[PDB]
Amino acid sequence: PIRRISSQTLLGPDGKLIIDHDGQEYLLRKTQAGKLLLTK
Amino acid sequence: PQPIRRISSQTLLGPDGKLIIDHDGQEYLLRKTQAGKLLLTK
């Protein structure tokens, strides 16, 4: 199956991970409402 | 060790282009679509 990783491992205390993909940055973040959200 | 902060999609998603992210017990999927786009779904 597809591997699993905890959002804690990806986000840290600042709640954000920058993902470099195909020459630009995407932001993965946890929101105040408790959701994960990816933006471009 | 420090938080990741910044990472390539190639390293994060691997050759299958998929990762399940467990966020407080709710699984999201991060993937590279067949068109090569990055997408987060639940």
CB-CB neighbors (< 8 A) of A21 in chain B: 8-9, 32, 38
The string of DSSP letters for A1-40 reads ---EEEHHHHHTTTTEEEEEETTEEEEEEE-TTS-EEEE-
Task: Kindly give, in sequence order, each residue whose CB lies less than 8 Å from that of residue B30, ignoring residues fewer than 6 positions away.
Answer: A28, A38, B12, B13, B18, B19, B20, B21, B38, B39, B40
Domains and CATH numbers, chain B: 1-42 (2.10.70.10)
- CA dihedral A14→A37→A4→B18, nearest 10 degrees, is -130
* Experimentally determined by: X-ray
Cβ contact B3–A22 (<8 Å):
no
Stretch 7-36 of chain B: residues touching chain A, C-beta under 8 Å: 7-9, 12, 14, 16, 18-24, 27-30, 32, 36
The data reach a resolution, in angstroms, of 1.5
